[PDB]
């Protein structure tokens, strides 16, 4: 996979995603949302997309990742949308690991206006069908 | 893919997901969680599932998507579970883009009670194994 | 798939993920983040990874899942990183369903420092390219 910039790291075959780094120092105030730049640009393999999903270390710090969909055709810089959920300010240092990028396949289909057939054992059910237990 | 309702939009081949719309005007109070209706019903391809994941625009507004798993067998209406993380009220207009739907394959297996073999280079490690850097 | 522990449940072929249970009673204070133990260990199929993603029932309760990436090579105990976003304390009972585990394939590639070609119809665009509507 062709990449531009230095904000991404190789991973081993047994690891699911690639570590993303912060391109510059970022300061998030309580409840604030910013689009952390990674300084990375890439060309995803045809038929695949990239998923930005959080890491253990930063997640347990009160930070979450929003959005997270890198389109196959995207050619711009990858940004990590992060929200600070703590009641205090947080600071993400330059080149600090902030997220993961996982390469997943996506199916492309045309949407056919039709009629949904109740041909399944669940059909209508949702939102707690088997209970809490 | 057969779909019912008007709350979903075609996407181009290079895009990963389909845009989901709000079926009606929704008002989220600070810290509130509601299941935004999309008025959409669908029949996912056998062996696949649907993933509800946020978009750039709304994410950076202090809104997040919870849950997000549409089962292959689901036949009901798709709802987007959204939480308002800001300290103010937010309003999602009718037919406003609120999320993305991405079609991913899922593996089905039987769970075999057995013994995990420490046959890997990580094995036990987790939660910040290489540090912050 | 070989598994150890009792904190996971079989699923039917039409369902995308497996239900994860809390290994012990957990008490989350407002805004708190804890790594809920599941008491589960597993050996993911080669080339695949596990995704921890929330469920309907608990999501609409003000609880969210952070991180969520189980590496193919992981051999330790699976933990669910949960944040309490409400203004009150929440309690997750023992063996209560708290999340879902979905088995997804991941592509492994080497990162080739190169030059991104503006060979797509989007290329640079991102963060609200078609508007809100
Ligand atoms: O964001 C979401 C999550 C789930 N569902 C629907 O809810 C069903 C799952 O509900 P269920 O009670 O079976 O389990 P849970 O999602 O609580 O684990 C899915 O098939 C669909 C939905 O519409 N939107
Ligand atoms: O929600 C999560 C996220 C991660 N892990 C475990 O933590 C390991 C990853 O930890 P590591 O320190 O290697 O990196 P990080 O998740 O901090 O990026 C995975 O293999 C597993 C887990 O149990 N639950
Ligand atoms: O966390 C994210 C989410 C999106 N993008 C970029 O933003 C583009 C999508 O933006 P667009 O305006 O097309 O739609 P939206 O993400 O608002 O649905 C993707 O191709 C890429 C990004 O860098 N990081
Ligand atoms: Mg979340």
Curated annotation (Swiss-Prot), chains A, B, C:
Q: What is the designated name of this protein?
A: Deoxyuridine 5'-triphosphate nucleotidohydrolase
């Amino acid at each position: 996979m062709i990449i531009e910039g230095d904000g991404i790291l190789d991973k081993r075959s047994e690891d699911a995603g690639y570590d993303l780094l912060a391109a510059k120092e970022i300061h998030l105030l309580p409840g604030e949302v910013k689009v952390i730049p990674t300084g990375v640009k890439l060309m995803l393999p045809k038929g695949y997309w990239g998923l930005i999903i959080g890491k253990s270390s930063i997640g347990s710090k009160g930070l979450d990742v929003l959005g997270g969909v890198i389109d196959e055709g995207y050619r711009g810089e990858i940004g990590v949308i992060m929200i600070n959920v703590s009641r205090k300010s947080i600071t993400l240092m330059e080149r600090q690991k902030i997220a993961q990028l996982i390469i997943l396949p996506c199916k492309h289909e045309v949407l056919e206006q039709g009629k949904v057939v109740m041909d399944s054992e669940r059909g209508d059910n949702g939102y707690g069908s088997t209970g809490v237990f």
